[PDB]
Every structure is written in C-alpha cells, then in structure tokens.
Write a protein that binds this ligand. Structure first.
Ligand SMILES: [Zn+2]
Lengths: 283, 190
C-alpha cells in the first residue's frame, strides 16, 4: 500500500507489458519480466469499500485476478476455535509435524510434476459455461442500464479454470473448473466490490475508485454551487469563504473544503468560473 | 635453424584447403571471397568452421587444439594466397577469423584449463571504450651508426633493440622509431 509513485509506474509497466525497459549511462535495453505478483496491503472501516479505504489507484487494483479481505469476525466460536488451535500449536509435536512435512514434500512433487507436463485445453462445455458467465455479468449491469463486464474479467475466469483443471491433472478444462471459477470470482466480487452503502456490487468502484454515490453527490454539489453563483450573478467576483458558508448553510451534508474545491474545479473545467485565490470569478 | 614442424604442416595444409575447396556448385568458394580484400578498408577473411571440417578431421581438430601456437602461420597462408591473384600494395597485412563453431561455453566454464584454445561464448555488453592504434611491428633507426633495424615484433610492454648489427657503434640508448614505416592495427576494449 505505501510504495511510491515511480514504483507504481514501473509495476504498471511490468504487469501490462511483461517486460522492463532501461535507458541509463549509455546502457539501452529491454528485459523479460514475466512474473506472478502476490501482494499484501493495508489501510478497518466497513462504511467504505477496499479501494475507497486503501491508498492505491484503480489502474493497479483492476489487474488482480482475485482480491481478498482479512478482518476479525467478532464471533465467540471463532475466538474459541482460534485460541484452541493456538493451544494445540503450543503443544505442537513431531507426531504430526513429520506428517505435515511429508505432505509438503509430496505437494512440492505434485506441483512440479503437474507444471512439467500438463496443458489444459478447451471443451465445448467449458466454452459454453464461460460464455454464459460473461453474459451473466453483462446482464447484471443491464438493470442499471450500464456496463458490468469486459474481456479482462473473462480472462480471469479462463485462467482460474485452467489452473483448476491442472490441479485435477486433466488435459481438458471442463465445466467442473468453470463452475468453481465462477464461485471464486463471484465470492471475490462480493467481498471486494460491494458498495457498503447499498449491499450491491458496483463495478465503478473497481474501474474508477469510488461508489456511484460519491459521483452523484459531487455532481449535485456542483449544480448547487452553480445555482448559488447564478443567484448572485449580478456580481462578477464572489468570495471563497462566503460561497463555502452559503453552501454549508443550505446543505444537509457537512460539506468539506475538498468537496467544495472539487466542485469549483469541475465548474472551471466546464468553463463556468475561474478561481483566483480567495475570489471566484464568472466566465 | 629450429622449426616448429606442427605449425609448418598446418600452414601447408590450410593453404591447400583454401585453394582446393570447391563449393556445392563447383567454383572455389574462398577464392571468390578473397577478391574483396583488394579494397583499402578490408583486412579480415571469414572462414566457416564446418567447411574446414569437411576437408579432414585431423586438420579441424589440430586447429582447435593448438590455436594460439598455430595462428600466425594461418595469416601467412592467406597473405601468400591473395598475393598470387591480383595486385595489392605489398605493405598490407591480412587476418583470418573463424565462425560456425559447433559448441558453446558458459562464462563460469572459462578457467585456466583452456588458455590458448579456440572457444565461443555469449554475454551482455555493459560498457565500451574508445578506438586506439596499437603497434605490432616496429622499425628503428640506430642513430650512432645510421643503420635501420626492421620487424621488431612487440609483446605486452614496448620493446626495442639496444645494440645493433653494426659492431663499431657501442650504443645502448640512441634509437629512433620510424613512425612512417612501422605498422599498426586498430584496438578496442569492452
Ligand atoms: Zn648502431
């Protein structure tokens, strides 16, 4: 979560292009950098979705095939089981450590063997199921008259289905893999992309960094600000603090300095006003 | 008096290889390529290792196993071969270079086992330095008796005569390099 902008930029380049470019001190070259990323991040606040809480932009967060959230459940039985597992670990002994070690060695061999020879390829059933999954995600947006699927989502489902097929050591990817891929993808969408303001998955969170609620509030604030300036339109210049007090005196929401300035910037990009220090001027 | 018989046999056989090796079609391959050396800019002739292999395995093996010891005699063979065919200023000198070598070695395999043997590697260039002229064969003028000394071949440090063939001279230091009749070659580090 707390890497700097240049690191974010080179990471974006690597994850999009799978190569890294260098030009320094007479050295000019291109390198192969096809690597699998696994990241751990931090801000909890249930009133806001993950991308709304953490620092990083949607350009990077939209690249992961799956996203997971880890927090305490406030469950007595969960604490009891966790403490019991901890007590069992306090008495951890060779009677089961050796068995876990043996299974770990066998698992390394299993992964190495599967990786060395197995190539899952498409089936008619898997193709139908994957097409249907994409159609389901497009249909989910149709009630709101909006986009809710695009090809990158289908790639995530395909990769997960191929991996599940390879776990079974199957040379065919098949409906067994796709239904599990849909399950994981749906669960991940539920946990990662739900708007806590409505309990519904809002794709614009993952593609723009905010709930559509924030967008609507910003637009309404800009229209209210425009109406306030127009109601005083006999004057060419209005004071910043006076406009802030007018808005905050007419709003139900406790509008912040950032919200007010974002609305001013939006109206400036719309060629309605110019902000000159402490004075707002009409165009 | 003394002669390195192995080197002399290699010179003779390599000259025969250049003059007798017909193409897939019937003309002598390296005879045609040799004509480009007439140009002022051109010094090096490229020879295919697999072509060399087809003549006799013994010669192929000997070249790879005895390269550093044998190399100057190959240059004399090419010098002779070109001089037969077409007119070139006689002060010019020629070089042989081999490619299509069948094997490759890692950087960490390069060890003092194979000092002097023909080898092939690959790597990534990090830095590259300027071009300079390097002295290969000096001509000196002995000042105390006005006599010239020719083809003083160099090694890592700059070497020169100290007493001349002319016995009455009794000199030790008064020698002058002829930078107009000496000969140089281009040199670069990477
Ligand atoms: Zn002298």
């Amino acid at each position: 979560d707390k890497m700097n902008e240049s690191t974010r930029s080179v990471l974006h380049e690597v994850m999009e292009q799978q190569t890294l470019s260098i030009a320094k001190a007479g050295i000019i070259c291109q390198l192969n950098a096809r690597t699998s990323v696994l990241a751990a991040a931090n801000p909890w606040n249930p009133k806001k979705t993950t991308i709304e809480n953490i620092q990083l932009p949607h350009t990077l967060l939209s690249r992961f095939d799956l996203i997971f959230l880890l927090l305490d459940p406030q469950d007595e039985a969960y604490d009891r089981r966790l403490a019991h597992h901890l007590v069992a670990l306090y008495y951890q002994s060779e009677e089961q450590a050796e068995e876990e070690l043996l299974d770990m060695a066998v698992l390394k061999d299993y992964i190495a063997y599967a990786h060395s020879t197995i190539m899952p390829r498409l089936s008619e059933e898997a193709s139908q199921a994957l097409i249907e999954a994409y159609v389901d995600m497009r249909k989910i947006g149709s009630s709101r008259g909006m986009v809710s699927a695009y090809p990158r989502q289908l790639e995530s489902l395909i990769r997960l289905a191929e991996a599940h097929a390879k776990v079974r050591l199957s040379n065919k990817v098949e409906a067994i893999d796709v239904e599990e891929a849909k399950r994981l993808h749906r669960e991940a969408l539920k946990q990662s992309a739900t708007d806590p303001r409505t309990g519904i998955v809002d794709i614009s969170i993952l593609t723009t960094g905010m709930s559509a609620t924030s967008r609507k509030r910003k637009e309404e604030l800009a229209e209210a600000l425009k109406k306030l300036i127009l109601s005083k339109g006999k004057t060419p210049a209005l004071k910043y603090q006076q406009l802030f007090e007018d808005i905050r005196g007419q709003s139900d929401i406790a509008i912040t300095k950032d919200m007010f300035e974002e609305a001013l910037r939006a109206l400036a990009d719309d060629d309605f006003l110019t902000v000159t220090g402490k004075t707002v001027r009409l165009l | 008096e003394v002669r390195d018989e192995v080197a002399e046999k290699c010179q003779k056989l390599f000259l025969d290889f250049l003059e007798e090796f017909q193409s897939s079609d019937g003309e002598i391959k390296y005879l045609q390529l040799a004509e480009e050396l007439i140009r002022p800019e051109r010094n090096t002739l490229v020879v295919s290792f697999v072509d060399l292999e087809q003549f006799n395995q013994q010669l192929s093996t000997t070249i790879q196993e005895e390269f550093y010891r044998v190399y100057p005699y190959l240059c004399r063979a090419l010098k002779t071969f070109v001089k037969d065919r077409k007119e070139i200023p006689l002060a010019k000198d020629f070089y042989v270079a081999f490619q299509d070598l069948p094997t490759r070695h890692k950087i960490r395999e390069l060890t003092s086992s194979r000092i002097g043997l023909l080898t092939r590697i690959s790597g990534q260039v990090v830095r590259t330095h300027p071009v300079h002229p390097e002295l290969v064969s000096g001509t000196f003028l002995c000042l105390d008796c006005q006599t010239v000394i020719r083809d003083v071949e160099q090694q890592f440090k700059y070497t020169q005569p100290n007493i001349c063939r002319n016995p009455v001279c009794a000199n030790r230091r008064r020698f002058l390099l002829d930078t107009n009749k000496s000969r140089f070659v281009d040199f670069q580090k990477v």
